[PDB]
Design a protein around this ligand. Structure first.
Ligand SMILES: [Zn+2]
Length: 58
């Protein structure tokens, strides 16, 4: 698997995702369409393309 799901922190602006059954962290990004806008919202990290999305529900 190279796309990982998790939850974003509104205060820290980060995506905490599961990889190999353990929590890992990446920053969401600072732009209006990238940052975490709702606490504990779903996020996805695509490790293959090095892209994170802290705003799409799917
Ligand atoms: Zn490729």
């Amino acid at each position: 698997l190279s796309k990982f799901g998790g939850e974003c922190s509104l205060k820290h602006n980060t995506c905490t995702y599961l990889k190999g059954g353990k929590n890992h962290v990446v920053n969401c990004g600072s732009a209006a369409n990238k940052k975490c806008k709702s606490d504990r919202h779903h996020c996805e990290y695509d490790e293959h393309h090095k892209r994170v999305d802290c705003q799409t529900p799917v």
